[model samples]
Target chain A: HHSGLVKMSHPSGDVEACMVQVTCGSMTLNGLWLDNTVWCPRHVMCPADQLSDPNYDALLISMTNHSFSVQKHIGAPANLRVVGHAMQGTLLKLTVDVANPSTPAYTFTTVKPGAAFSVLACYNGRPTGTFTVVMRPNYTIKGSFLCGSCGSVGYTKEGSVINFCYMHQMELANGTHTGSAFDGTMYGAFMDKQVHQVQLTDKYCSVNVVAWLYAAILNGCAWFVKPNRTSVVSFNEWALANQFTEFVGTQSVDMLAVKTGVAIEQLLYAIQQLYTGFQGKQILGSTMLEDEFTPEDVNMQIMGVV
Target chain B: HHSGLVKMSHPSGDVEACMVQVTCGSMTLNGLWLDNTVWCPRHVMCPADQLSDPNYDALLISMTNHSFSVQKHIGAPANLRVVGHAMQGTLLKLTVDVANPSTPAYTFTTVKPGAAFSVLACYNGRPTGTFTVVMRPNYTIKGSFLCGSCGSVGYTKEGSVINFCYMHQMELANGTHTGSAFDGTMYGAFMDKQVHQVQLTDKYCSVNVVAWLYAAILNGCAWFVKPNRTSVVSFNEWALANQFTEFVGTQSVDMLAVKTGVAIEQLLYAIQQLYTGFQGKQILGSTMLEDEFTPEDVNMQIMGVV
Candidate 1:
């Protein structure tokens, strides 16, 4: 009965850790659900599928909490829509437009996703001074796998805290990196879910693939936090269904450079050069901060930006 | 105090037009707000610079409902999906299927946006056909406007659905490029509110400008959906604020070509190419871009600095 759902209870006596189970059909996946945020082996899960022809690690799961949230409210309507599409042959462009009348101005207190906002409200041609916003710490209990066998899962927990499940594994003990991500010990609580792990081949570099996978999971978690609350919603939805996939292989940076007869650094350099006009922008002889650069804007900084 | 606010009241008696004003700072831009969606001037608003700019025209506004909406009901839970996408240098391909065992294929009686499905249920390899889908008619009430002075409105509306607002138009009277889009009229209503309709110069062909504008809006809308929700998400977010503007004017598209020495159409072709293995093909047999049509992919799509 505890299948296809997510529940949480405490670790009895000031314990932030507690026993949890993920059941899919006849198989019951087990792990410890914790309430912590940081890189820790004490907060990961590995799927061990053997009877279903389990030879390698294939899935990872974890949980935690976030400061960002989406709250519903009744307020003045302001149409924040964007008009843009992926260019057939060039870089996609974006333009933000307010498509409503009466509404004259509004400010973006913050553009950082999952961050709090100081939104002001207007009504009947005047400030109602009734501007308000409410947010509750969010709860995310989920897992990420390379295949459909790993996409959706229904699980039950014993603790009660809103958090996110963040699964991690650099490599398995079996000297391989594909298949099941598990190699015996994950979160220190498993007995017989051992699966096989295979080394990567030239056709597919797990390192790059895993790097790509990491991007996907982080993107997914971010998506869960704020799916469609922006000026450009439709385009993002299309990109999500069309662009994000684990099938990207043999298309790493070095390989792409070889194919194009260009060096990877050269390409990155050109990209870096093209992005020079983003900050310190001037509009009508005045300074206009179109946007700010994050540390990831640099090549060295980009490695872990996602 | 009403100088910095926005509001709406129903039209008097049989009249469907409402009074409204848009103020940037101390200046109030006046116009009529209509509750309709059609090719009519009566359903429009013009931003007259004069107070209540008792003039001919300046902006336009309209609002209404659509035939599109989603519904819910009990249904099956079979994995019905598509395996197709646009490949770099190739035409788009699609392969739809039932990705699981036990679930007899479900049919899509009406392939329309915002429609319900007859999803069948599968209990671990057994089909119950006790199909289910939980949906109810969704509602969307909205507005659109064109100003004689500004276009990019900074206001935001309630509801967290981030979709790109794609407003398309080609040329207009008033010799300028800003006014009601009816080659003559839309949906048959007119009431004397006209805006500047200027013609574009070679340096700013409305066609290319609109194309570029479209990309920006789509990108903005897409960004709204999950702004940074992909491997390239962060990179794109950066590029939007930094790169991708039409700096070339006469050479916008042309300069884009020279910068990477690749044309836009050619780039699209290449994008279509890389997406070839996305459907119906086994991963092993995929002719992946271990390296690719090097030229365009390097210029346009490779900005991620991967």
Candidate 2:
């Protein structure tokens, strides 16, 4: 249809038209989550669980006295590319944008045994695009499990004890303490006694836990835009995280890196989709989470254009 | 100066407030590029110097008579914090935006060189905030040779080359030979000839190059409103490249990733100096080419901002 006030006409012949268009903004794939043509990445979310003795510094707030810290992420001037994730042997393809048609792209690749091979595209001297990375799972297929000490468990041995509180930590906010920021005097004032039971993976060898908290706020974003070229801008993981911490934690969680097939896959997929568009990552399960978050049958968009 | 149409006697906070009260457009700065402070990249025009081969790509073009393809980049996004030649052994500190003000950051270390590191803020699940990958550069004095090129290096050794006109190569539209893009015919196109020039150090290396080509028309990008706020929107690089090709090269030379350190930095500074209400990379550098284009003081306009 017409993207808000802008009209998109499908003509059978050479056509000439001028219309108002998005000079700048985020691009999104609305119905893409439901398109059968799309595949791979059934879900996308934070990959790890909380670890009790975790050494890092994220503030979680439970009622009586839990540990919590709020972390801040100052984002750079980078845009997300709508991408897909697929593989061969174990190669992940991240489709990047062809924004400047003429200039060449600064592509990045990695190959560290378990790391896999992939390519990324940088725009204006910064990485704003990704392709697939070829990878060989360091560990075998790990099933998702309920992590305790730490919350979620996948393949990586490392869990988020200090970094991120268990997703359940979301429950400790208003019910408990008034302030639970990273710099606060008493950390996790609300999370300790108030924390809901955190389940650690008692068994399971490996499993992937992914999500897109951004998806939860789609309605809020829709209220801000007309849902035309705004889809790409809709699911900003950064915004989602912000809202989660502000509303739920009452405390902030520090952000950190993780080593897991599932975790790498999300990053890998993100890298590809941004670089190659949707063709980069076309694995079988990548889109599993799309429908849960996005609508259905949305066409792929160009990150460069947005 | 007041970004929002509705004046706030006090201050309204958050990205929305920044967006509405700011100049225009939605926002994006979630990655490492933006760390809360202003980040402005300049747009430049490198008029062909047949005598100097100064643009690097120009040399490749004249040397081989074949089209020149060049991609300039700053090695980045290395497995969380893989060091680049530029960041080899220095106390590199990156500013991060702790939007939440809770979780500060988590750390990661390197095994090979044993570099201490951390991801500052939350990103794609991982703490992707701008954390510094601190190191003691293996190189002393941290000397820099910004000067590039071995001239006509071939794919055999350094991996860069060029060829004369492929008169015999088949054309798609009569006088043309390259196949339809959808057809995937990569061979024999003028574009392919230049592809031979870039000899990558690794299969994957992130280099964010901002190209500045000549365009016949400005495309009235000027009509697009200026952007302000956390999202940092501005017109730039690729647009100028298009206009350059259309105007001067007539689509001859592709201006992939031109230098941005000087140009971009200057442009951004200038925009902001405008009561600090910077246009960032809004306007491309052109009209200036009329007078010799001698490394025009990119910082000059920045001086004009204030």
Candidate 3:
């Protein structure tokens, strides 16, 4: 680990303090998520349905996700201790100690409510050689049902819709409709339609949903390695919200970011999974319809695709 | 940068699986805190009194903290885009893009109420050369007081009516009292006595008190450079008093980590500043007292040294 020091002065007056958002053109993966031993998405991905299935063999096995608990480890910081007092006037010396010589390192059996662990060393101005071990956040079991309105895209006449299509909206180089759907040149262009159609429950497997999505992706991602060009940044303004910060829907950008950034990933992954399942069962990809056309006299062509 | 991808399968059966915590003998300073600039103390330190005083010249100067906003950089993702559509079979192909040919490498002039930026790359599961651009977290300003608490610590002899000594604590290994006063050998050991706690309103400075404590210490003090051993960690528990997650102290370790980690550096810097300011002005250290001791066999003696 390389250590360097930098400094910044607080801004004066009524002017607000600013934050810098640096997006690393490149960065090594932060091991915090992996280190905390929480069941990250990449770690596990079971069918959401198996969460409650009583016959699920995996949940019933010995020493599994079901039976996993805190395992005794030699280095993990269990009974953490910190001591500090004034010394030689200006110096406030400190000493940090743990219950065991070492508790456990990356060996926690569970990351549930009671599960606790600390970084093996001191941080943030603790004793020079020691570390201030903080616990893996013990998240209380509370619930949330993030509801969103997902819309659809298609061609329609006023509130009365004509057709709902995915690729019918594009235009060709000749300025004609790109999608030669089972439609005519006189067909109106497609428009994005806002629909009231989204629902989710945390009651379901929250961890599973998140986990599966991460695993769905490949890791060891490389980078362009732009140091000065990178930044991690955020600036929030809850004061303007008419309601509380959590429920604040002011412009709804924050809420959307949460849903879109977090929720959408899993949601899309879930939907993709469901779509695949249905496709395999022949439930989603099948379509049937009727059509009419008038050429010279009156005739129509019929077609079907699976 | 090192790239390693370790995969874990969902534990089979109900048997609980666990992870072991390993103390890192060393580790790279998580770039998250540094990468995402929010005035991390280790990054910088300046005077603290400048926070509340209106006469503070720094706050009034030309765009001091004002000029400190997101700048427009070509390499930095200005408009991030992620496109994932079904590729071969169920495998979805993802492509990441940005509005700019390339965003500013590192620039932004404003980090305001609605300012938002993202890395223009698709992360995870993307084909080689693709990077997932995560949005820089955009936090809302609920209002900031940057407030702090100031207290004094010296000594007090329990409930007994004796002298409150400043330097009477340590003991010598020679079976004799150490830190003896010229006034009395009956001088009790020094006890840390916190006196006259004060209150602060968010209207003054919203930052929490302890948040300021760490800031008082010089930021950017070097580290042992053991990436495996170093960590930035804290664990807080706000016990059960409610059911809703938000109310469940769910203001949360996440929120606290953000505030505490961010707030402490600045707060401490402020405290240290005040201490330094007071010490330099002789306001923090100016005590005078007389000493007297009378032995049964001898007369009396008075010693003076500055």
Candidate 4:
């Protein structure tokens, strides 16, 4: 009654908190994951309706020594399964071949929607920097919503000390969802999360959607974006489904204002319109992108505006 | 050693998974959250660069008919004093007001930041609902990233389990930080997660960052975005203290594109830039907001995303 079809996982990369009912079981949503550590989202009862939204599993919690190794991987079998159709516009290459001893892969492309999908590919010791994902497409009800990407998941902290609670990221665009976020406006989120007082709009701004910390504070450098204290979103899961597309040319950068101590002439980038939060209610949340990358060696990482 | 500080707390308001880490005796970290509910920060071992990112803690492993009322809450008040402040074109309000005489004095306003912040009322049991978050100032950022709505903070997971493990967002910036997330992505980052890799770019495309079940495949509909999965990037207790000038707004909102459902939308905003492989990582991490306010929200209620 406490652990039937359980799969309580966290380290973020959530599939609805990845298991932990301690009671109630019987399910199988089956595979789909990459790096995201681990999470076993197979929640039963009903299983459908809620518009579908299902197809999650990317387990990989390791340590081995002390004890930890949850894995549901899907790669290295000689991986490379590409099949994108729907609104198709694909390309994903990171292939390198000497004679193809193969295994240095990190590519995944699936426009799939015929329904079913199950993906994974997480490697460490490196057959070669492995990382792949493609869970076709399910979460039903189409025509309007489906803008997910909890772009990340996990939020466990229940029962018997729930494995020590660690799956952090309580919504802002998570929970294996589909469309709904961009209602914007989240200043200082709320006293910068005054001790979870309620997680200051999620512990203070920038869950991506154009937030290089206010795009580097409007090019002048709000003092090198002030280093960030949580808030910065955009890693694009296919630009998070593709929302009609914009940006003419994309992929952003603001590496915490070049790791703080900015002086690259104060940073730059425009044409703007990234993360518009003035309509939330009376508002004051804007992000015109001040700089770090559109170029400039491209500010290291944090890309695609997902 | 094992039964020492096992701090298993929920404090109510919502989100409670397992809970048990009582390793008292020698445990330091304020004797390891001494009374329970752990709250050590503001400066301690204080080297916290967000621990380089990748942390998850909901360790409450059962055995609590009330640990004898946590020793009556360690004799009422052992530690919990985290005031507030978010300055900038600011304004804050948090009132759940408890009156009871005849039941008058309703109150409301639970933690508004800028504008007005309002919700009026709702939170009647579970799902955690209370509402009230309105802002103003060209404003927008008032409760944008904290949905679970109700009073903003509630999560669920029936079948396979997942009582609260969906928190993805937190890499808190503010300077000096560098690449490598938790042991250099050696594989670590949980509790509301990130990392579901799907990249391919030379001209090709495919990129998903920081991961939370890919934002639940598009905003996750209504609620769910919990990923701190491995969102670690502490910033040595405020990275040398840099609110810089605070600048409420000069301009921001970079990667705008919303629509989901038949499609999908990624990049809530992206003024910063940089793109190459994996779609051009520019920073995809946030959603772990809490600056302390003293464990009181009924302890930690459950559902409700409003």
Candidate 5:
């Protein structure tokens, strides 16, 4: 089969494109360049047959403005890897060795979409690399890349053609992006000290939770999120290691203190101060992203350039 | 100084009396026939000077309808003790060895006011018994009696002439009581099945938290209370062991499962079902106590008979 092109639209009505050198799997789908956008039928550069499949449902486009690189492989199967300096707003330039002698390797560059982002790449239905981006607010990004067995990224144990994507965006009030995509609410809350709580309505992704937590730490808010009972978030060992674990039925300030390395009294005092200060203050403006962009817009941005 | 008497009013407009044989520290204060009532000057069986002292501020009257007894000592200081079968709605008959041969050992009898109640008794500045009542809803009461150093019950390090009391009352809609005093809301919620959350306004008492948790287990609600950050509830190792710890910054359903011995999915499923069933149903009746009694009313009741 011939190589494919994946297009995405930007919030600014600009388009971006990534040439899919091969379609091994979601995470393994090798592309020339990665961008922050969603992949839907409207923006998909693949054939009609590819769009009808379940593999393409809710596909994500990982992009960033921060520098990110693979850190180390975790296990022999190497399903997980630590990302080196993958903070939001940083640039990422990934160079993968290819079999083509004429084009010995392909370099993929984009901005880090969120505080924490991960992707798996495979070649011809075999494992190649797992890219991850992580960072703390007001800190540098840490990125990782690893390669595991065929089944590492939720494909068949033996492996098959699939595609996977992960992205996070943190849009500041000034139209600048910061943490992860999910960090928008928390970042806004942090910026507006008068905001005591922020509701997270994103799909349950552990990366999003971690991003929110980092934003909270920056704002001196509570570390844990108040998820409704039905809310489900995805996480792995990598996420857990960073102290971004699932919420227990109920947690305490003391527990947050231990998890975040802050004193219980201090955390409580901070929250008390935040709450006290919030009283009698009227909300100034909306905390939502003003220049919203859909997957089509991002893809259009890419396709227009290509 | 001569011995004094303590009196309290019953919710039924009846009066009850307890003979304060001595004025030890709050926990060490020795009294006869403890009742479920507050201590104020109006019903004080002591002199005016005793009423004016700071020792009488917010003193609780430990009462129960269930049976309770001290099981075993905890540490060398013996500040904590295990309770034997101290469930709510049970009878309690305590026999403490008295120094006076004429009285030998005065036996104290009263119904438990709540699911978990504790009292500290002292005689002449000496530690006597640390009475505790713990019970699960629809289960028998487990009572513990401990005697620690003077400071065990929040008094002087050595000992002093003071008084201490603890009580929890779970009132049923039918006028019968079950669980702890703090359990009323939970029990009502459990009974009604329409309550998804109960706002706990009790003066931060760990015993009340435990009571609410037990009630949640029975009612299938989330095990954690949504407390305002400023809310401070008192607790100790006993409460912690029962998995009744303070609220961290925030909590999750998974944590409650570990503490309550229920699976996370099951708890979540239960909560989901409850919320779904409650969507269209109208709230039936009031959950508040009907025959509410104030401290003065209870004191008047006691003084009327004393």
Candidate 6:
């Protein structure tokens, strides 16, 4: 039949997706030809299981038309090489060699992931709504799409199924986002595993662990520390303690203050002060969560608390 | 006699300067035609007196050819309006309205100053090699040119004549830069006035002030604190103290340790720990010095000290 460049335009008319049509030329192509190629599904699909799993790592391949191909592998194939890389404003371009003589090279372009990305989450067995992706180092991709009318989906992880919802109630509580999903909270499944592991380890000196602890305390996650002690737990000791429990979803700031023997206001003040100082140092390459703890978000939570 | 866009190529052939030539149509014009414009020298010259003066404020006008026009003014002219502003990689573009009917608009383009820019510092009454420009929020422009055979120049500021030397010995000592100007140090003229004022004010809680204090102490600027204290000066108290003197170019880390009644190793450790924590928080939109104290530079100095 006909072979050329095909464009898929969005209804908004501002975004378009591109694909190259290959001519088989009297040869019958067998097996699945889903998107005009016989590439492995693993190479193209963003795993449904790892969508909200913070520990998931994937090779994020962005195409020239702002579309992405994601795959999980120990490392990228040796034959695949980046020929060129350039950034223009927020957009990025990477010319890659795919080792095929017929299509030896392809240029991939997309907005840098740190700024924003597009996604879709399934609701009631039907995928709906374009969403924004939030990413962090050593963490999973999170979809910032909220739908109050839909039921939550569950995914299996480590032999247990965890409910998934793409909403951040704390963000809403701080008036950062407004929608009908007032009761929905971001799933804790997106918390960084390294941060969680830090609570179980004897390392309290790392900046990441300390900041995470401060954020958890400010968010009224009192179960992150031991309960009911007459003496105050020093900041270093609390960070080093390995017997932390998960938040039960009903803890308050006052409870944490009483347990830590430090007023909630005092803890908040310390976190605020330290965060401000640390932020200043990051300008020199020296350098956060909700489902991500950043100083800005935590500061917003502090406002909500005070 | 002729009118067109003329490009002046550098000897390296990698950089070019551009200017527009206008036909006079046989009209004899008086006064000076240093370049192609009747614009006042005040609008174009980067003042020699203010070159190394940290208090200077000027409008930095970059042309499309990577050439810059700098001026000191109370404010930009009302008729001058920016029509477009964009950044591609490290390059910047700004389209502006000059309020002229004949040539009402012009586009200015240059590499963003934060990355790098060309400068020519006068030595021995003659301009020398192209140098790099270093800038801070409220500080004057600095040239990073070093000439071992040339003598130093002086400029008047607040009734005091300060020696100008475009070298940073500490940077060389830390091995960040290697050159023939091993004996020269960055003139104290480049220090930020706001940071200097912090030492004279009661405001110690600001992150900027605290980091400066830490950097000064780490760099062996022992005169920054009161000498001969039997008890250690607390971090907060050191930040708030107003009575401080300038470094005399012979102070060592050990002297600072003894003055504050804390061991040099312990002070370094505290600074290292706090700086690490502060750097982590900067990633959340929260967030200097030799002549500029930054965490990276201070960390390098810490390495040199230990």
Candidate 1 structure quality by residue, lDDT tens digits, A1-306? 001100111111111112222233333222222221111121122233344243223322121121111111122232223332111111111122422222212211111211111111111112111110111111111111111112111111112222222222222332211111111132222222333433222121112222222222222211111122221233234324433212222244333334234333332222222234324322211121111111111111123111
Better candidate number, 2 or 4, judged by TM-score: 4
**Which lDDT tens digits does candidate 5 get at residues B63-167?**
221212221111111111112212122112233332222111122222222323233323322323222233333222222212221111211111111222222
| Candidate 3 Cα outliers beyond 4 Å, as residue runs | A1-45, A48-54, A58-306, B1-141, B148-306
TM-score of 2: 0.17
- Judge candidate 4 at residue B194 and give its lDDT: 28
Better of 1 and 5 by DockQ: 1
DockQ of 3: 0.01
lDDT of 2 by residue, B258-301 (tens): 32112333322222233232233332322111111111111111
Candidate 2 segments whose C-alpha is farther than 4 A from its true place: A1-191, A194-306, B1-45, B48-306
The positional error of residue A273 in candidate 6, measured at the CA in angstroms, is 11
Task: Please write out the lDDT profile of model 2 over residues A137-163, one tens digit for every residue.
Answer: 221111111111011101111122111
**Candidate 1, residue A37: lDDT:** 11
What tens-digit string does per-residue lDDT give for candidate 3 at B11-115? 110000000011101210100001222110010111233322222123223222322222221112222233321121111112333232311122212221111
Off by over 4 Å in 5: A1-259, A262-306, B1-166, B169-306
**Interface RMSD for each candidate model?**
27.6, 25.3, 32.3, 21.4, 38.0, 29.1
What digit string (tens of lDDT, one per residue) describes model 6 on residues A128-202?
A: 222233332211233222322122121111111111212221112111221111122222222212122211111
In order, what DockQ does each candidate have? 0.01, 0.01, 0.01, 0.01, 0.01, 0.01
- Tell me the tens digit of each residue's lDDT in model 4 across B153-181: 21122322223211112221111010111
Docking quality band of candidate 4, CAPRI definitions: incorrect
Tens-place lDDT per residue, model 1, B1-306, is 001111111111111111122222232222212221111122112233542332322211121121111111112232223332111111011122322222211111211111111221111122111111111111111111123212111111122211111111211331112122222221112122333422222111111222222222222211111112222233234324532212222333444445443334433333233244323321212222111112211222222110
> Among the candidates, what TM-score does chain A have in each?
0.17, 0.15, 0.15, 0.21, 0.21, 0.22
Q: Give the 10-residue window scoring lowest on summed lDDT in candidate 4 chain A.
A: A1-10
